[PDB]
Amino acid sequence: MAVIADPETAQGFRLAGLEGYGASSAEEAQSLLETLVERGGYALVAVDEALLPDPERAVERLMRGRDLPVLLPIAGLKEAFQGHDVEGYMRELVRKTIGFDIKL
Amino acid sequence: MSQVSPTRMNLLQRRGQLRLAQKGVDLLKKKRDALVAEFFGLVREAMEARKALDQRYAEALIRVANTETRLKKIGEEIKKTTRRVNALEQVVIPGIRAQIRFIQQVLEQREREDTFRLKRIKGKIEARE
Amino acid sequence: DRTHPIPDLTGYITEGQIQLSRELHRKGIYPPIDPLPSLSRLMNNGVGKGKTREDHKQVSDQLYSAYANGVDIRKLVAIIGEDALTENDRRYLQFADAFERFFINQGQQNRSIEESLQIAWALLSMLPQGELKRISKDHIGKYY
Amino acid sequence: DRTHPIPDLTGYITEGQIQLSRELHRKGIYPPIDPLPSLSRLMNNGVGKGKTREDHKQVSDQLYSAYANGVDIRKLVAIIGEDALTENDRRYLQFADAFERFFINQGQQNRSIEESLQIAWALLSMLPQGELKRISKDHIGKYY
Amino acid sequence: LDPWYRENVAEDYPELRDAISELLQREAGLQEIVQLVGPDALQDAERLVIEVGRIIREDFLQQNAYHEVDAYCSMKKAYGIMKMILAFYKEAEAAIKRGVSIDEILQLPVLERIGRARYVSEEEFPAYFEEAMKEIQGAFKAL
Amino acid sequence: LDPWYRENVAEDYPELRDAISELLQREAGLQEIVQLVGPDALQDAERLVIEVGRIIREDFLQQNAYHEVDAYCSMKKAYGIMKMILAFYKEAEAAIKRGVSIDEILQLPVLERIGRARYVSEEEFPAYFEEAMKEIQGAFKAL
């Protein structure tokens, strides 16, 4: 697995032994997805959601491939955690499923 | 054709959609199962992750996403291109039974009524003679 | 062909109809009665207190409902697998087998209505008491 | 049944046909005219410069084509889901609703041919100009 | 027949039945969708429509031929029951628009009285309109 | 005619043909459903029934009028082939119940021999029953 996050965080995942890669924009980050995808060995890429606001369009762009890494937006940069990413990730995931923008 | 087409036709149709229905309630049960492992994953995630920020403290981090990342790993994308799976599927499937149903009844229209203008014409020849 | 003019015109002359089906007979279910095409076109006129027993309609309604649900669940088992069925649905699935094995099947044998209601109540015990929507509480207390 | 021998043999005796549909009436669209099954046989003899307006045939052709595509796309939406429809198809899907809401529906009201062509051009704006295959460029520049 | 009702029974007969039918029509559409995506995603506005739609079905459409009273429902009683239901609807939608929990409206005390209104043989039924309004006010009070 | 078979050929003639017919009956119902919802949702239990149902059709129902041997199938041979098929069924359902992959049973070596059994003119056919049991044991071994 690789993790794509803001550079300070990415550094911290590395010190923990994980494979963190640093980016500061939606585009930069998509670039990072494409290098990883081409380079080949990852089964999953967890991406700060601030860096992956459109992960379907993200897949769309990566390739003429070939077997893909699951692509997982999670939340960000420093101020992107001191939100809660999840309340809204959850609003989207239930609408996503049942179809119903439920009043949370 | 004619007769026989008559009943297997629509029980393919009726008996065969009674059980397409039934995969429909099956998957909203999965709905409620899936969405509840959905937010909680979410939970610890938000969690000690930024326990990672103010950072050893190295794990408030991977401790963080070993929990955080794992939970939302299963839940997050296993949990639905497969959830949104279950249910995105079996419905273009009650599409089958749907418009294709119009199918069996223009088909059936066509002839227990056409086959009849006829049992009766021939009567009609030496029925009339 | 139940729509042939002969059998079709006969339906109006009856108070009770028992319709047998080849498909059911080929599944080894005897008597090969289609439980969704047999009607007390006049059944209610021959049942209850002073005729059979007061709980007869309730028991008949509950067995019919549970057997129909159980048969649909055979379809659901095929769709999802046996292990994915809920505990409640599994009971209804099992009830359909019990209805076929014990109520439908007779080892040639003249069952009194009392005998038939007893078998009916015995198989009904397989269902959760909380799931007996079609039997008033008065009958559950007195007969269950 | 529009194929019943009576209505079916009547079609040849007409110069204009207005076909009403129960399905459309049940959607609350009145008058319940099927815009893809109503035709004018002698229509070309009563339209154009000096009769209605020079762009009448082009506008009629484009509205008919766009409405027919839009109606088929209602089927495609049912097959794939609304979100899986392309941006271009979504415009044609929406055009079918616009045609029904604004062109077919009249709040009882005597529209001049000028009024009717104006509504036609207004709804046509919903479509990409690059997708107006049945309107010559001369008419687009002059009337769009 | 609308003019006979408007002149002899109630000026709002046609508008009332059109409004109830639109309610029932909307319920039918909602139930079709719920059959697909389940009822969990339902907004409060849609839950209110099902709540009132259900009251129309149970309190109005359904009539007891075996009850000595509800066996026949005089014209005067029919409109009065309609206005109690339609007035509860307006108040329901108005309360929701002001962030009143639907759960709070669903257990509103007057609802049980509206449910037994078909059994009342006295106009005590139109009194339910004022009883409905004050009760909603007690819900505007608690917020 | 069941008693003639029971007394002169095999005590289990009627029970065996009823069991095979129930198999074929079940297959017919399964194929109707599969025609609708496809075969992907099929449980292992249902895939096993189709597997054995197919063996009944190909190994029993089908007979080669042009083969010097299978042109005629003596009563003694008919029951022996039936018991090989029915015994394979019981073992198949028993193995599945113990979490044996159906794919493992489908490629069981004895199956190809059961398929050519109609061509054998010697009782070497009933030996297939023991050959079937041990082979399933080799599948109970590997688990």
Domain map of chain A by residue range?
1-100
Deposited resolution, Å: 9.7
b/e code E115-143 from CB counts within 10 Å (16+ = b): eebbebeeeebbebbebbeebbeebeeee
The DSSP call for residue A69 is P
What's the CA dihedral at D91, D94, D96, D99 to 10 degrees? Answer: -110
**Which chains are adjacent to chain E, needing at least 3 Cβ pairs under 8 Å?**
A, B
Partner residues linked to A21 by β-bridges: A4
Q: Where do we find the tokens 């209110």?
A: E48
> Nearest CA of chain C to the CA of F131: how many Å?
31
The Cα–Cα gap between E79 and F81 comes to 79
Cβ separation B16–F41 shorter than 8 A: no
Give yes or no for a contact between E78 and E117, defined as CB atoms under 8 angstroms apart: no
Do E and B make contact via 3 or more CB pairs under 8 A? The reply is yes
- Neighboring chain E residues of A101 at a CB cutoff of 8 Å: 41
The two beta strands, A44-48 and D39-40, are unpaired
Nearest Cα residue in chain B from C79: B23
- Neighboring chain B residues of F32 at a CB cutoff of 8 Å: 8, 11-12, 15-16
Give yes or no for a contact between D73 and D91, defined as CB atoms under 8 angstroms apart: no
What's the CA dihedral at B64, B68, B74, B78 to 10 degrees? Answer: -120
Do A and F make contact via 3 or more CB pairs under 8 A? The reply is no
Give yes or no for a contact between C98 and C82, defined as CB atoms under 8 angstroms apart: no
- Neighboring chain D residues of B93 at a CB cutoff of 8 Å: none
Q: Among B27, B29, B36, B39, which would you mutate to test the A interface (most chain A Cβ atoms within 10 Å of its Cβ)?
A: B39
> Nearest CA of chain B to the CA of A52: how many Å?
15
The Cα–Cα gap between B60 and B50 comes to 8
The Cα–Cα gap between B48 and B40 comes to 14
The DSSP call for residue D33 is B
The Cα–Cα gap between C29 and C23 comes to 9
The Cα–Cα gap between C87 and E142 comes to 43
Question: Is residue B6 less than 8 Å (CB to CB) from chain D?
Answer: no
The DSSP call for residue A76 is -
Q: What is the residue type of C131?
A: E
Which DSSP string do the residues of D34-93 spell out, in sequence order? -TTT-EESSGGGS-STTTS-TTHHHHHHHHHHHHHHHHHHHHHHHHH-GGGS-HHHHHHH
- Cβ-in-10-Å burial (0-12, 13-18, 19+) of E109 comes to exposed
The Cα–Cα gap between C138 and C63 comes to 17
Q: Where do we find the tokens 């997708």?
A: D131
The Cα–Cα gap between F52 and B19 comes to 24
The Cα–Cα gap between C139 and C135 comes to 7
The Cα–Cα gap between D129 and D141 comes to 11
Question: Is residue C85 less than 8 Å (CB to CB) from chain F?
Answer: no
Cβ separation C27–F25 shorter than 8 A: yes
> Nearest CA of chain B to the CA of F42: how many Å?
12
In three-state secondary structure terms, A20 is strand
Chain B: which residues have CB within 8 Å of chain F?
8, 11-12, 15-17, 19-20, 23, 90, 93, 96-97
Give yes or no for a contact between E75 and E5, defined as CB atoms under 8 angstroms apart: yes
From C26, C28, C78, residue closest to F46, measured CB to CB: C78
Give yes or no for a contact between D99 and D123, defined as CB atoms under 8 angstroms apart: yes
In three-state secondary structure terms, A48 is strand
How open is the CA angle F91-F94-F96, to the nearest 5 degrees?
Answer: 110
Q: Among B11, B14, B15, which would you mutate to test the F interface (most chain F Cβ atoms within 10 Å of its Cβ)?
A: B15
* In A1-104, alpha helices (H): 7-15, 26-39, 55-62, 86-98
Longest CA pairwise span in chain A (Å): 43
**Contact pairs from chain A to chain B, CB under 8 Å:** 80
Give yes or no for a contact between A77 and A6, defined as CB atoms under 8 angstroms apart: yes
The Cα–Cα gap between F53 and F47 comes to 10
Length of chain B (residues):
129
Give yes or no for a contact between F48 and F105, defined as CB atoms under 8 angstroms apart: yes
Structure tokens at B25: 């309630």
Give yes or no for a contact between A74 and B70, defined as CB atoms under 8 angstroms apart: no
Nearest Cα residue in chain C from B112: C3
- Neighboring chain B residues of D79 at a CB cutoff of 8 Å: 92, 95
The Cα–Cα gap between E44 and E97 comes to 9
Q: What is the residue type of C128?
A: P
Comparing C-alpha atoms, which of D45, D21, D46, D22 is closest to residue D35?
D21
- Cβ-in-10-Å burial (0-12, 13-18, 19+) of E56 comes to buried
The Cα–Cα gap between A76 and A51 comes to 8
In three-state secondary structure terms, C34 is coil
The Cα–Cα gap between F26 and C24 comes to 11
Q: In sequence order, what are the residues at sequence separation of 6 or more whose Cβ sits closer than 8 angstroms to the Cβ of residue C23?
A: none
The Cα–Cα gap between A81 and B49 comes to 8
The two beta strands, A20-22 and A70-74, are unpaired
For residue C15, what are the CA distances in angstroms to C11, C12, C56?
Answer: 9, 8, 17
- Cβ-in-10-Å burial (0-12, 13-18, 19+) of C130 comes to exposed
How open is the CA angle A15-A18-A23, to the nearest 5 degrees?
Answer: 85
Give yes or no for a contact between C78 and F43, defined as CB atoms under 8 angstroms apart: yes
In three-state secondary structure terms, C18 is coil
Chain A: which residues have CB within 8 Å of chain E?
94-95, 98-103
Cβ separation F37–B23 shorter than 8 A: yes
The Cα–Cα gap between D103 and C100 comes to 61
Neighbours of A9 (CB within 10 A): 24
Structure tokens at E36: 């697909």
- Start-to-end C-alpha separation, chain D: 40
Q: In sequence order, what are the residues at sequence separation of 6 or more whose Cβ sits closer than 8 angstroms to the Cβ of residue C17?
A: C11, C37, C38, C39, C41
